């Protein structure tokens, strides 16, 4: 049972992985709510550069998307390898 330790390294792992998807959710949804006010100031005759903005917004909202999908993949996969040493120590 190096599977303890495996288990363990393979739960921080995935621990990291899950806060790192959090944050990129959180970066995404800040992303999201400047769409809305880029939009808002573009639509008040404000910003003529205001639908621009808020197109970049959406790359960025939806690349943090992406990102966090990615990371929650990789601590699942972290999780099975961990479950699977648990079930052996
Ligand atoms: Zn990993």
Redesign the pocket.
């Known amino acids: 049972a190096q599977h303890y330790a495996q288990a363990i390294h393979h739960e921080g ?2 621990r ?2 899950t806060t790192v998807a959090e944050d990129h959710r959180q970066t995404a949804n800040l992303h999201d709510n400047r769409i809305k006010a880029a939009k808002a100031r573009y639509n008040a005759g404000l910003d003529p550069n205001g639908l621009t903005s808020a197109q970049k917004h959406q790359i960025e909202r939806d690349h943090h998307l992406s990102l966090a999908a990615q990371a929650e993949r ?2 699942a ?2 999780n099975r390898e961990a479950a699977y040493h648990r079930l052996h120590s």
């Open positions: 792992l995935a990291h992985h990789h601590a996969t972290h």
